[PDB]
Each structure stands twice: as C-alpha cells, then as structure tokens.
Amino acid sequence: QFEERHLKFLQQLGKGNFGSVEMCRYDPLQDNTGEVVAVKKLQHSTEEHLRDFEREIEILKSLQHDNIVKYKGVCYSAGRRNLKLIMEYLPYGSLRDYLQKHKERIDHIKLLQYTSQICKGMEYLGTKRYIHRDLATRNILVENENRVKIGDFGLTKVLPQDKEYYKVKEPGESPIFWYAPESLTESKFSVASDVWSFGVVLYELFTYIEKSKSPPAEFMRMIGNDKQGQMIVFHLIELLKNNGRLPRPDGCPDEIYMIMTECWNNNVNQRPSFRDLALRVDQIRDNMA
C-alpha cells in the first residue's frame, strides 16, 4: 500500500537482532505534509528470516487493541525482497529509556497504570493463542504519558491447535534473564512463560532502570561474573531451581514484590493468569488513589 519512492529516511529509532526500525516520512505529494511513520526492516534478508518476517506481519495485522502498536501497511521494492513493515510512530520511544529519563516524575501509581495496560495487551494476545516470547521494557513503547503499547512481535508464535506450549530453539542470542526455567531447559514457551517474563518486566519498572540493578547485572552477581558462555545458562538454571530470585527493588511495596514472586513460580501451572494480575494491580492502584 506504501510505495518506497515516497518513504524519506529521517533517522534510526531502534535495533533488535535481525531487524531495525527507522523514523521516516511518508510524503507522496512531495510537499512535506506527509505523516511520520516507523518502518521495520530485516538487517539480513535470509529466506528463513523473510518467512519469519511475513508471519510476524500477519500476526501484527491481526491485532487491534489499545495497548498494541498499530499496523499501517507493507512496502516492497522489485520482486518482494526488501520487505518493510509500516507502523505508527510513537513520539516518546521505548519505555526503558523513557523511564530512565523521567524517574523523578514517575511515581508508583503511574508505574501501576503502565503495568495494567501491559497486562491488558498480553491478555488480548493470549485470547488469540499468541505467545509473545520477548516481554521486556525495551519492547514497550510510549504513546503519551498515560499510554504504553507492546511494540515488537519478532519472536511471537502461534500455539498449536492441540497443545498449550510451543517448543523452539532459534540460533542466535536469547534474552535468558527474562526466560522461565522451562524455557531455558526445554525451550517451552507458553502463556505461563510470558507471565514469568511479565514478572521480570515488573521488576524492571520498579528499579526505574538503574543499570546496576538490571536483571542481567543482578543475576550475574548472584552466579559470579567468572562464568562464560554455556556455563552462565547452566548456573542460571541451577540458581532458579533452588529458588534464587531477583531481589525486591528499592522502594517497592511488598504487595508488588509478592506479585513478582508469584509470577516467578517454578511450577508453570501455579502462576497467575493475566486477568488475575490485572485485577490485583487495579485494586492496589485504587487503594493508592
């Protein structure tokens, strides 16, 4: 629907693994009145990566929710390599950097507003049997001071018709410090592993993204910075099996930390649903207000 001749590059907005997003201006009339959009492209157009990208585009096109970034269209040059995904541009960037910038004006009830919006987005995802697999504040975008949106779906899979989990080990680097134990050990991804990751997101928010307090720093201090390569993952597994967990962040109430620890249950079936998390978060929010 968008033709590449009219997309004018302004700057780079973010990079993941295998993809990047650029701020561009769609200006078909060539009079600087077109709208600013975000454009996602692959950094190395493999055909495996291209099929993954087509499936991701199909997933994002099928989602319509207040806390999910909006699909706008696609764009391809000759043949259909150079495939690009057009999305709405969200003016405040990712929640990670935003929260780092404004820690002095974001109080706990605002964090709980963000938490509840994320939970509604994730529950919507679950009703379509989608598993996000990459829930982290770096993947949350800020539309304005009162609204966040889930922003990337490059790792998202659809559950098989007959099972409640999806087994997958991609080559490349994996956000192992947001991963549930069963995802580290058996590469199993389910709604419950997304709930584990959501607990890590809650931790992130309440640390206000102090980098020494990031999940990687804390886990690597708990297992010792000696470890290299595979050993890291191995020790992580073993640390999670003896109920090692990230500590309560400074200033976090015990109710919030209890939500976190309940998401970090070793037993996949004993973890809360996203609807229950939304309820608990909304009642804490209403108690504070």
Ligand SMILES: N#CC[C@@H](C1CCCC1)n1cc(-c2nc(Nc3ccc(C4CCNCC4)cc3)nc3[nH]ccc23)cn1
């Ligand atoms: N998710 C997610 C993570 C990554 C994707 C992961 C895989 C590829 C990239 N990522 C997505 C966006 C992104 N950013 C924006 N706006 C925006 C506006 C301003 C700023 C700056 C903010 C502060 N001042 C200086 C400039 C940054 C961003 N809009 C978007 N729409 C769709 C995506 C998207 C940015 N990184």
